[PDB]
Amino acid sequence: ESFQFSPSYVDVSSISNFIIGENEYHEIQGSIQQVCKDINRVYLMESEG
């Protein structure tokens, strides 16, 4: 909503300050489960996979 544009803006990086974004965030979607018998010994890795 800010950013009155002009010409003479040359590289996107220069005005990249004004772009709409998600500010990031965090969610849960947890509760996991156990592998083998050990609930403490589990690990968690989230990725593209």
Binding site: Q34, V35, C36, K37
Partner: protein
Amino acid sequence: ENANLPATETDEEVLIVDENGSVIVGGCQYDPDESGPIYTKYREAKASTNSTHTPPTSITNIQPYITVYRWIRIA
């Protein structure tokens, strides 16, 4: 027929039954979670080669042969 067969052995080293072996089977365990991939190969047995057919390819024992006419002399 089976007795027509050279002495066959399959190349890469395969496991078989014995009472003497190094490989522990296990007869029981934790398989507490059924959730593990349950990979159970079946029993120790005889492995069928080309079981699909007893009637193999029958190699011609005809040798290079020009059929030539034969009318035998009655006398």
